Design a protein around this nucleic acid. Structure first.
Ligand code: MG
Ligand code: MG
Ligand code: MG
Ligand code: MG
Ligand code: MG
Ligand code: MG
Ligand code: MG
Ligand code: MG
Ligand code: MG
Ligand code: MG
Length: 1105
RNA sequence: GGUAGGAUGGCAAGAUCCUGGUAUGCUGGGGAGCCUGAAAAGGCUACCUAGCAAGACCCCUUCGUGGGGUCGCAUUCUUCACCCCCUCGCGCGAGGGGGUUC
DNA sequence: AGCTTGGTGTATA
DNA sequence: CCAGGATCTTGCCATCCTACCTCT
DNA sequence: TATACACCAAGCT
């Protein structure tokens, strides 16, 4: 029964959270909080230690599978070529460990007269070379690999280092020659640097290159006299590689023409569009005001801009010799940031970049492409545009000219500007046609060419369609469930309010220094772009620019060990590892030899330098601190100082603490994407407005409504001085959403001005009619929120993960143990029997009328019966026969000939037995490996109730009391628990606390707890629902920096978190009135039993039907 | 005007994936050197080789516990049930995507 | 002889 | 780690559109 | 505006 009410929706997006409020209004006064809920989500992250999202881990695993499958196919095709040549591939076994290396060495060194020996060594060498071929730019062809210098400079430096280290000069000094020589001279030497945790020097230090392996192949071919066609076939088989590709479904669509893909920046239509649009936005002085350029002025400037081979027309040049303006400042509306010494008029106007690159490539390589040079001078702009589009879109996964194949290879080697622009090629051609004909700008050209009005906006995505961004998708899924539920409860909202991750309350000095930072960044990047384009890099990436900057800043030396480095052997090490949240911000990037990076791994700089011998921590710190500010460089003075401090702080960390930087891109994207989808919902549902306000407006509105989280939720003081922030209670997201429902644009401007004035600095109330009206309308909001928190209606819930997907086991395969049948059997050895038939036979041997195994790990269950025979259904194992066992007394499954421990528990099944006045409880912890080996990872299976065989790790490592009670027939399954199920202990709270939980519950009497795991057969891990771990972690952080600022409650919280309540199942489920609460999207517990997970009481839940 | 939102282009700083690779690592099979040993078998350091989620679907084939091909760790209430949407698109049982109020 | 803490291994760059 | 493609965020400059808000 | 779990061992009642 839907009852319609006037209500507003408040949306607080977050990185790992979203606050959602449905607040019913009357006039502009809030009448009732219909629903306030903080939903805690994972941001797409499944494993916090891995750091990466589930989508990212799946993509990496899928691409590892794809790489290995194509490697299989490539090596099989090489085997076929070797069999056609008569060359014997290296066998799988019964060969010397250095047979391939010595074959490579001997074939490089001397001609082998015996044809049989020559073919065998050639096949050994080539098959091994294909297995270990080194690295190539994946976008380069095999012909491009052949055109590289041979060997690479990395291998020449390695060769010089090896000759100096070993006092011998091998000729010609190939990788195979040096490796075979060193594997014989120093047995047990490691070839490449590896991840560290005795430590001897490796043979090589830098990454092996495919041109080095190719040069060794050429040397072997020249020494052995192989025919050139044979060498060519072997090269194309060894260095075969799939070209990287872009799926076209990953490319966005033109908003005006959704059937068309967005155009590449390489397109000549986009180049023409850029020039014409920029000229259409310039203004000329007219009677102390600005006027648009006339049609003739526009055509003159546009023809001067298009007719360019190099970017040499500045805005001052355009004003002075092209426009014939009497003064340089007469040209107004220049699209550049204003700076000193007339920088805006010193900046370059756009040009046809693709035509300039193609003309440069033609004039440089007229020998290689004379037919293409003639065709390019022959054809017109439309045919050139079609050719350029084909050349720029050839990289799509899914030429009209009969060009010679060498010329086609040269053009595919030609580099064009990358990146997609907003419009399609057809749209750009039409829009540019309208502006060049009518003299209009982009807006009027869009109106004319596409028949739209001044109110036109691009089409927005709907609520049901995702972005592919994990944080945004989590926020969107939660919001759309909330909105669907709230719409069927109370109708559509009157208005929707969304908070955007933007901030404007900044000082003029802050604005000036950020402007100077942007100016210095642009000047340095333009310069470094110029020398990199002179060096041979067409379109430098941000990481290219960072690499050039750090190579200039450290004089082409490693930042860690000081070894000399170059462009191709350097690595950009994340000082804070990516798996520990480490960002790509340039203070987190260190230029590194590569050996230092590979040895450092995930370990922090200090925890690696402390025990290492290659680098010195203090030497690295002093080299960073000894950097001096030049006259002109990338950073400003303040930026250079803060950059050195950030780098030093990143080197100094001795623990795997997460990244210092709190990135807000995902929050901003979530806010903008959810706003676009809420605008779509409002168009489809007649919502009057979807307003947006900044975060600081919401914080200032909380300040001026006297909404304190510690007062609202009666949270005790954690600091001796001042009050705790909003983040101590996780309900603050829902509070922020409620506050967001009150905001109007005028009061938002007033509170933004007020907060900006207080940053630029007790206190003074804001002064505006909108502030007065909003304050009088939302005077009662404080009392309403106090009553809502008093009746505990603001819920904190995590969405459940019920799908049985993810990692089936741990990634480390383990060797099996062995145990003889006739020997004495302990309980743990009986629990570790791999084969289910042998396990069941031994189970029946220990207890005949039995389905489960009832043992203790330390008890000697069976004696050393010297004539014991285990009779399977396909074999009889005598007392001498050896039974395969899992290596450890923990849950594990057989995977690919080895043993793998089970992964995290998917769920726990709750079993209750005993009398009704005092029942006994136990958990059956079920992993995805249990479901996999039980065959339950299939269609039509309820994973929480489907039976698990006794040989599964779940039933093997259940508690002995649970096993005896299930076998005796008294224990029945009454429910299930997943990580994230809320345990509401009731108004009485937790009554079985002892030791540390009692001391935590004196100051934080939490009745709502979240299941986080099941750490053994008798325990469940619970953390409080309403309390944040980041607040406790920053308590621990500020405790070191400040003297005893934490209160008793602050210290108690700081030591309770993060392990929290490692609780006993018997001591948790013994609380009467404890409820396992599963909530609807509005934060309301699901009590009616339907086809969605519902709340249940472990005391009174019936056994499963 | 002032604030806010949106378009396009530029510039700056970032975030998320996607495609293709490399070098290790683990397990199985090996073994170059060293050591402990030998009437008495295993280590250590490397290197070689195969596999690297369990598995699923398709086609083989000059028949087999194999060969080849495409996939499989995302979309957090699994499965079931109901309702909605796009697509197997004749008012279809279906392939995906969404929602289910306490 | 059971619960409470403490430490640590887990596939990587 | 490597190259390099796609999607997007935030801030500033230029232009165009929208909406409301505030003081003479 | 964010980020460990399942196993293995001590430890004082
Ligand atoms: Mg917020
Ligand atoms: Mg490969
Ligand atoms: Mg290789
Ligand atoms: Mg090596
Ligand atoms: Mg690193
Ligand atoms: Mg929030
Ligand atoms: Mg290997
Ligand atoms: Mg090896
Ligand atoms: Mg496989
Ligand atoms: Mg579902």
């Amino acid at each position: 029964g839907t009852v319609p009410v006037t209500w507003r929706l408040g949306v607080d997006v977050g990185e790992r959270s979203i606050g959602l409020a449905a607040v019913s209004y009357e006039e502009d006064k809030p009448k009732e909080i219909l629903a306030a809920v903080s939903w805690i989500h994972d941001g797409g992250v499944g494993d916090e230690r891995s750091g990466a999202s589930r989508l990212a881990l799946r993509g990496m695993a899928r691409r590892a599978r794809r790489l290995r499958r194509f490697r299989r196919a490539r090596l099989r095709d090489l085997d076929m070529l070797l069999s056609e040549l008569g060359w014997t591939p290296l066998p799988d076994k019964n060969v010397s460990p250095v047979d391939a290396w010595l074959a490579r060495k001997r074939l490089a060194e001397e001609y082998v007269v015996d044809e049989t020996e020559r073919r065998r060594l050639l096949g050994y060498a080539v098959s091994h070379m294909a297995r270990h071929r080194g690295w190539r730019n994946p976008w380069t062809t095999i012909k491009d690999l052949k055109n590289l210098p041979q060997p690479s400079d990395s291998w020449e430096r390695t060769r010089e280092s090896l000759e100096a280290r070993y006092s011998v000069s091998l000729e010609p000094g190939t990788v195979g020659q040096w490796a075979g020589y060193l594997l014989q001279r120093a047995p047990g030497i490691r070839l490449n640097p590896t991840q560290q945790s005795l430590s001897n020097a490796t043979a090589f230090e830098t990454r092996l290159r495919q041109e080095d392996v190719l040069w060794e192949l050429r040397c072997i071919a020249d020494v052995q006299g192989l025919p050139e066609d044979v060498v060519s076939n072997v090269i194309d088989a060894v260095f075969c590689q799939k070209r990287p590709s872009v799926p076209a479904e990953r490319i966005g669509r033109d908003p005006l023409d959704p059937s068309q893909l967005r155009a590449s920046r390489a397109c000549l239509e986009f180049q023409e569009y850029r020039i014409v649009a920029a000229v259409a936005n310039l203004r000329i002085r007219d009677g102390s005001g600005s006027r648009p350029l006339s049609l003739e002025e526009r055509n003159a400037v546009i023809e001067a801009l298009l007719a360019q081979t190099e970017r040499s027309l500045t805005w001052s040049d355009i004003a002075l010799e092209i426009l014939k303006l009497p003064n340089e400042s007469d040209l107004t509306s220049v699209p550049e940031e204003d700076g000193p010494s007339s920088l805006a008029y010193s900046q370059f106007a756009p040009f046809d970049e693709t035509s300039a690159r193609i003309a440069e490539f033609i004039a440089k390589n007229r020998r290689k492409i004379p037919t293409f040079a003639q065709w390019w001078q022959e054809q017109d702009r439309t045919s050139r545009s079609d050719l350029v589009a084909a050349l720029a879109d050839n990289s799509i996964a899914g030429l009209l000219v009969h060009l010679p194949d060498a010329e086609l290879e040269a053009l595919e080697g030609l580099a064009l500007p990358s990146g997609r622009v907003a419009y399609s090629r057809l749209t750009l051609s039409g829009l540019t046609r309208v502006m060049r004909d009518d003299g209009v700008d982009v807006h009027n050209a869009r109106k004319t060419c596409f028949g739209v009005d001044d109110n036109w906006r691009p089409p927005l995505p709907a609520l049901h369609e995702a972005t592919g961004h994990p944080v945004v998708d989590r926020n969107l899924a939660i919001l759309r469930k909330f909105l669907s539920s709230a719409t069927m409860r109370w109708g559509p909202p009157q208005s929707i309010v969304v908070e955007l991750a933007r901030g404007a309350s900044e000082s003029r000095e802050r604005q000036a220094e950020e402007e100077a930072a942007r100016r210095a960044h642009r000047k340095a990047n333009d310069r470094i772009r110029a020398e990199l384009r002179a060096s041979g890099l067409s379109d430098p990436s941000p990481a290219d620019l960072v690499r050039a900057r750090l190579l200039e800043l450290y004089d082409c030396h490693c930042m860690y060990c000081g070894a000399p480095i170059s462009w191709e052997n350097s690595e950009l090490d994340h000082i804070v590892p990516r798996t520990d949240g480490g960002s790509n911000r340039h203070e987190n990037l260190a230029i590194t030899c590569g050996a230092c990076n590979k040895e450092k791994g995930r370990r922090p700089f200090a925890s690696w330098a402390e025990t290492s011998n290659r680098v010195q921590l203090r030497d690295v710190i002093d080299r960073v601190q000894k950097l001096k500010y030049s006259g002109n460089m990338y950073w400003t003075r303040d930026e250079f100082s803060r950059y050195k401090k950030s780098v030093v702080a990143r080197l100094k960390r001795r623990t795997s603490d997460p990244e210092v930087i709190q990135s807000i891109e995902s929050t901003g994207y979530a806010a903008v994407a959810l706003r676009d989808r809420l605008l779509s919902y409002g168009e489809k549902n007649g919502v009057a407005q979807v307003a947006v306000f900044r975060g600081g407006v919401t914080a200032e509105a909380r300040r001026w409504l006297d909404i304190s989280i510690e007062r609202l939720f009666s949270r005790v003081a954690i600091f001796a001085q001042s009050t705790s922030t909003k983040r101590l209670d996780r309900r603050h997201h829902a509070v922020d959403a409620v506050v967001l429902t009150t905001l109007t644009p005028g009061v938002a401007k007033t509170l933004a001005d007020a907060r900006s004035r207080r940053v630029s600095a007790s206190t003074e109330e804001p002064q505006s009619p909108a502030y007065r009206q909003w304050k009088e309308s939302c005077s009662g909001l404080g009392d309403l929120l106090i009553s809502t928190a008093a009746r505990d209606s603001i819920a904190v819930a995590a969405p459940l993960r019920l799908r049985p997907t993810g990692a089936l086991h741990e990634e480390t395969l383990r060797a099996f143990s062995e145990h003889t049948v006739g020997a004495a059997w302990k309980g743990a050895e009986l629990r570790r029997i791999v084969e289910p038939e042998v396990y069941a036979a031994f189970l029946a041997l220990t207890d005949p009328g039995g389905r489960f195994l009832k043992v203790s790990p330390s008890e000697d269950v069976l004696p050393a019966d010297e004539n014991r025979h285990i009779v399977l259904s396909d074999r009889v194992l005598g007392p001498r026969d050896r039974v395969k066992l899992f290596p450890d007394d923990r849950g594990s499954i057989r995977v690919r000939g080895g043993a793998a421990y089970i992964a995290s528990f998917h769920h726990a099944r709750v079993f209750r037995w005993g009398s009704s006045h005092s029942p006994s409880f136990a958990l059956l912890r079920v992993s995805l490996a249990d479901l996999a080996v039980a065959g339950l990872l299939r269609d039509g299976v309820d994973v929480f109730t489907a039976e698990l065989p006794p040989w599964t790790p779940a039933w093997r490592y259940a508690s002995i009391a649970l096993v005896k009670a299930v076998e005796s027939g008294d224990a029945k399954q009454v429910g299930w628990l997943v990580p994230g199920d809320e345990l509401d202990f009731g108004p009485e709270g937790v009554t079985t606390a002892a030791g540390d939980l009692s001391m935590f519950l004196k100051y934080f009497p939490e009745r709502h707890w979240v299941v986080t795991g099941f750490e053994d057969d008798k325990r469940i891990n619970l953390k409080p629902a309403f309390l944040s771990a980041e607040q406790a972690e920053v308590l621990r952080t500020e405790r070191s920096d400040r003297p005893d600022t934490l209160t008793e409650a602050g210290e108690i919280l700081a030591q309770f978190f993060p392990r929290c309540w490692r609780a006993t199942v018997a001591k948790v489920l013994c609380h009467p009135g404890l409820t396992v609460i599963r909530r609807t999207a509005l934060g309301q517990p699901r009590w009616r039993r339907g086809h969605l997970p519902y709340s249940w009481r472990p005391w009174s839940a019936d056994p499963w039907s």
